[PDB]
């Protein structure tokens, strides 16, 4: 008895099982649709430090997957390469059908070592991990996924009104992270600017900030040196908060731009 | 409304598999067709905030039932939920012994 | 025909979706594979249970033949096919009102 939403006159009335309302008309199975809506649209924190907290590892529960016919572009998607600290596999390899989430503005690729208590990784929020029209309850290794929930819809009159046209470019950038103690409270992440330069990661940092940081490091960060890989603590030294608003929020406009000079860098050690 | 939920995204940018009717070229053929990445299509439903927002709420609500249904089922891969909803709809409206002028049966004279 | 029919049926079934209200629906915060099942005992009616056992024994013939025909490794559509067939027979086409082939009750 999953709730089946009925769209009438561009208004969403969830259906009533017992009522068998005469009005609603299901002409064909085309009208039936499953929609996978991302969590990022729900106002949840979407940065990898906070997002990892919602994911969790448990064992003794079999993984399940569902198909969602249509999905929403996700600003942030995550690809995990977690391995156990001895190098053992932590996340199950993707089954043949499973493929990466189709449309992602920012792919957060986390490769690192973490305690891996459970056989599989599950979403503590109850949501599904969306993979290319397949919604799973378990994280699969090395496949881009966007955490989301699946909604089932009865589309209106199949008159091309909904999901057939835009009533009214795909460029995906990979933000590569490295993590230790993945899946525990004591987790630390390093944003990987390049092979030799890493930046300590905090929740405040947004993907736009991280890309700007990458540019700033490249232009004037003296990233290349013989000392070794450099881990930099970074703080935007601007009075306003960094990326409080969500991606949709205020169309991300009139947003203060943190010129390269504002960012402050110190070497952790 | 969706203020129970902390933030509702006003814009819905949806990616979906292409419609069967639109494609006419010799790209249906798998060999000559688009790769997995290219099959998708795009849309934006920004104009109507109320429907899409309600929709996010509906998805948050339905996830509980979906999870329980998955727990009960033994399906490794479940693709029959929509069909089961369809058969439920038909079985419900037209299960049988439906009065010609009754609440149970949709049929209406003339 | 059956030699001995167990009069009482102790059945293990998956939990009702309506029954669960706690945050155990969440897979991570939830019962393991063993916990999902819900118990029951249909001891009240012996005749029904013995009919059910006879029915199962008779149906296995068709079930095995149907499995042979199908190429499914795992066949989960038998119930859906029964529902579709039930609807298709009741309402396949051109129901006759007065006629009992399609039983729609005039007032």
């Amino acid at each position: 008895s999953i709730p089946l939403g009925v769209i009438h006159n561009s208004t969403l009335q969830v259906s009533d099982v017992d009522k068998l309302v005469c009005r609603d008309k299901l002409s064909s199975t085309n009208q039936l649709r499953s929609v996978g809506l991302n969590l990022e649209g729900n106002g949840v924190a979407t940065d990898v430090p906070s997002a990892t907290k919602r994911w969790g590892f448990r064992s003794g529960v079999p993984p399940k997957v569902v198909n969602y016919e249509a999905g929403e572009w996700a600003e942030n998607c995550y690809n995990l390469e977690i391995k156990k600290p001895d190098g053992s596999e932590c996340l199950p390899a993707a089954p043949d059908g499973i493929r990466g989430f189709p449309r992602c503005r920012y792919v957060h690729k986390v490769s690192g070592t973490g305690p891996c208590a459970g056989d599989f990784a599950f979403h503590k929020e109850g949501a599904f991990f969306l993979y290319d029209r397949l919604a799973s309850t378990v994280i699969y290794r090395g496949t881009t996924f966007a955490e989301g929930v699946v909604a089932f819809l009865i589309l209106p009159q199949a008159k091309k009104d909904f999901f057939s046209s835009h009533p009214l470019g795909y460029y995906s950038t990979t933000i590569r992270y490295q993590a230790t103690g993945f899946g525990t409270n004591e987790t630390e992440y390093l944003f990987e600017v390049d092979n030799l330069t890493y930046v300590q990661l905090e929740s405040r940092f947004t993907p736009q900030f991280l890309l700007q940081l990458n540019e700033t490091i490249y232009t004037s960060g003296k990233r290349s040196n013989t000392t070794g890989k450099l881990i930099w603590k970074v703080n935007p030294e601007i009075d306003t908060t960094i990326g409080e608003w969500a991606f949709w929020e205020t169309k991300k406009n009139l947003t203060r731009k943190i010129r390269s000079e504002e960012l402050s860098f110190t070497v952790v050690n | 409304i969706v203020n129970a939920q902390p933030k509702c995204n006003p814009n819905l940018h949806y990616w979906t598999t292409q419609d069967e009717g639109a494609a006419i070229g010799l790209a249906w053929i798998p060999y000559f067709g688009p790769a997995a990445e290219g099959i998708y299509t795009e849309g934006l439903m920004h104009n109507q905030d109320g429907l899409i927002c309600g929709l996010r709420q509906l998805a948050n609500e339905t996830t509980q039932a979906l999870q329980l249904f998955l727990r009960a089922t033994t399906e490794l891969r479940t693709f029959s939920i929509l069909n089961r909803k369809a058969i439920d709809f038909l079985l419900q409206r037209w299960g049988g012994t439906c009065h010609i002028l009754g609440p149970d049966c949709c049929i209406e004279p003339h | 025909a059956q030699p001995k029919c167990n009069p009482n049926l102790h059945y293990w079934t998956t939990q009702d979706e309506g029954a669960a209200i706690g945050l155990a629906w969440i897979p991570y915060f939830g019962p393991a594979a063993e916990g999902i099942y819900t118990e029951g005992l249909m001891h009240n009616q012996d005749g029904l249970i013995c009919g059910l056992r006879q029915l199962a024994n008779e149906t296995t013939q068709a079930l095995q033949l149907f499995l042979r025909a199908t190429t499914e490794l795992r066949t989960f559509s038998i119930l859906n096919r029964k529902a579709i067939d039930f609807l298709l027979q009741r309402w396949g086409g051109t129901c006759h009102i007065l006629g009992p082939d399609c039983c729609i009750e005039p007032h």
Partner: antibody, heavy 115, light 103 residues
């Protein structure tokens, strides 16, 4: 910020009663409101809950087939249609809103139903 | 199903004292216990979000303690308004309440 309950009264064993819980200061449509029944001197038990949009209706074991609960989101009102009332149902009923562990957070003033 | 038991059915203490009220679950619930304070004759008020988290606007003196199977609530200073009865609710399955505890 306020939940108001109404419809309580005297009903003979059997029969039906409708309990109306109305939301003031909240858009009830958004939140999943719940009904909790406190028997006099015998503690609290949860009787039913609804999803925000009304798609999911959830009932306790005792009233699984007896109570029908529905929400009119337009009016920010919740209706609990008690039916086939039994002797034990003679208790005050509270309507509350869901929380982090399916936790009733804002409690409207209880109404009394007597059989 | 799981059965909720508050160990102290009733206890009496003076103002300014340390008191712990314990609610025990027959089977472990993953920190899904929330506490309710019911003033006598008034609708219950939520206290602890889930085992430890303290509801906004509830006095900080109330402290939520949580564990896998056994949960406790401690009142720091026993002000007179806090002398009212308390309840424990589980959220693992069926949302049962423990038998109320009387101060």
């Amino acid at each position: 910020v306020q939940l108001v309950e109404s419809g309580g009264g005297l009903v003979q064993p059997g029969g039906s009663l409708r309990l109306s819980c109305a939301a003031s200061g909240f858009t009830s449509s958004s939140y999943a409101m719940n009904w909790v029944r406190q028997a006099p001197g015998k503690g609290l038990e949860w009787v039913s809950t609804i999803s925000g949009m009304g798609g999911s209706t959830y009932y306790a074991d005792s009233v699984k087939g007896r109570f029908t609960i529905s929400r009119d989101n337009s009016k920010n009102t919740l209706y609990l249609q008690m039916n086939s009332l039994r002797a034990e149902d003679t208790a005050v009923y509270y309507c509350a809103k869901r929380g982090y562990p399916h936790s009733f957070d804002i409690w409207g003033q209880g109404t009394m139903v007597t059989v | 199903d799981i059965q909720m038991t508050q160990s102290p059915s009733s206890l009496s203490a003076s103002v300014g004292d340390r008191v712990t009220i314990t609610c025990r679950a027959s089977q472990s619930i993953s920190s899904f216990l929330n506490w309710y304070q019911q003033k006598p004759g008034k609708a219950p008020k939520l206290l602890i979000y889930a085992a430890s988290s303290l509801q906004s606007g509830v006095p900080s003196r109330f402290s939520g303690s949580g564990s896998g199977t056994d949960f406790t609530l401690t009142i720091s200073s026993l002000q007179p308004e806090d002398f009212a009865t308390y309840y424990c609710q589980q959220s693992y399955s069926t949302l049962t309440f423990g038998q109320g505890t009387r101060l």
